[PDB]
Design a protein around this motif. Structure first.
Motif, mmCIF file in Angstrom:
data_model
loop_
_atom_site.group_PDB
_atom_site.id
_atom_site.type_symbol
_atom_site.label_atom_id
_atom_site.label_comp_id
_atom_site.label_asym_id
_atom_site.label_seq_id
_atom_site.Cartn_x
_atom_site.Cartn_y
_atom_site.Cartn_z
ATOM 1 N N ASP A 43 0.842 -1.207 0.000
ATOM 2 C CA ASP A 43 0.000 0.000 0.000
ATOM 3 C C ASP A 43 0.882 1.264 0.000
ATOM 4 O O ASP A 43 0.487 2.343 0.439
ATOM 5 C CB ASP A 43 -0.993 0.045 1.167
ATOM 6 C CG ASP A 43 -0.311 -0.058 2.515
ATOM 7 O OD1 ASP A 43 -1.000 -0.239 3.553
ATOM 8 O OD2 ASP A 43 0.949 0.012 2.507
ATOM 9 N N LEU A 44 2.102 1.101 -0.506
ATOM 10 C CA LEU A 44 3.070 2.220 -0.588
ATOM 11 C C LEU A 44 3.213 2.828 0.803
ATOM 12 O O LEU A 44 3.240 1.983 1.718
ATOM 13 C CB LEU A 44 2.651 3.173 -1.679
ATOM 14 C CG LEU A 44 2.463 2.507 -3.060
ATOM 15 C CD1 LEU A 44 2.223 3.562 -4.115
ATOM 16 C CD2 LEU A 44 3.686 1.661 -3.395
ATOM 17 N N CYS A 61 8.892 2.429 0.591
ATOM 18 C CA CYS A 61 7.751 1.856 1.288
ATOM 19 C C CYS A 61 7.377 0.478 0.713
ATOM 20 O O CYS A 61 6.999 -0.456 1.440
ATOM 21 C CB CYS A 61 6.547 2.805 1.209
ATOM 22 S SG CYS A 61 6.881 4.314 2.197
ATOM 23 N N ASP A 65 7.078 -2.992 2.755
ATOM 24 C CA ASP A 65 5.910 -3.896 2.804
ATOM 25 C C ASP A 65 6.311 -5.303 2.415
ATOM 26 O O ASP A 65 5.873 -6.289 3.007
ATOM 27 C CB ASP A 65 4.796 -3.380 1.880
ATOM 28 C CG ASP A 65 4.098 -2.147 2.405
ATOM 29 O OD1 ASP A 65 3.661 -1.293 1.613
ATOM 30 O OD2 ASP A 65 3.915 -1.993 3.613
HETATM 31 CA CA CA Z 1 3.154 0.385 3.390
#
Ligand code: CA
Length: 122
Positions: A43-44, A61, A65
């Motif tokens: 989800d960046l 990011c 993740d």
């Molecule tokens: Ca994330």
């Protein structure tokens, strides 16, 4: 899964640029790694601290993740979290390398805030 899945996973989540680069190459050819059934979702930087200046941290990011989701699924999140968080910080600082003067300082400051947030609420 293949018996060398743990070593592959470790190789994509070290703090070095060559580890980041190996992950980037794999992320762009996800199909070649299907036998490993990695979770490639991200989800960046959703739910990260504010980034008023817009430093481009999405790729950092994403690899963060990848470490969290895949170590959670492997059942060894607690043991590897601090490394994944540090690699996240190293990825962000490599972004900041492209700015100089005052902007470098502002970038590093935002990166430290991102690092602290995952270290404390991750
Ligand atoms: Ca994330």
């Amino acid at each position: 899964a293949p018996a060398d899945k743990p070593q592959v996973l470790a190789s994509f989540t070290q703090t070095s640029a060559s580890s980041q680069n190996a992950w980037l190459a794999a992320n762009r050819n996800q199909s070649a790694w299907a036998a490993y059934e990695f979770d490639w979702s991200t989800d960046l930087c959703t739910q990260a601290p504010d980034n008023p200046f817009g430093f481009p941290f999405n790729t950092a990011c994403a690899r963060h993740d990848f470490g969290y989701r895949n170590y959670k699924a492997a059942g060894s999140f607690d043991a590897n979290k601090s490394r994944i968080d540090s690699a996240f910080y190293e990825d962000m600082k490599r972004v900041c390398t492209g700015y100089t003067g005052e902007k470098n300082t502002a970038c590093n400051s935002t990166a430290w805030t991102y690092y602290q947030a995952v270290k404390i609420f991750g």
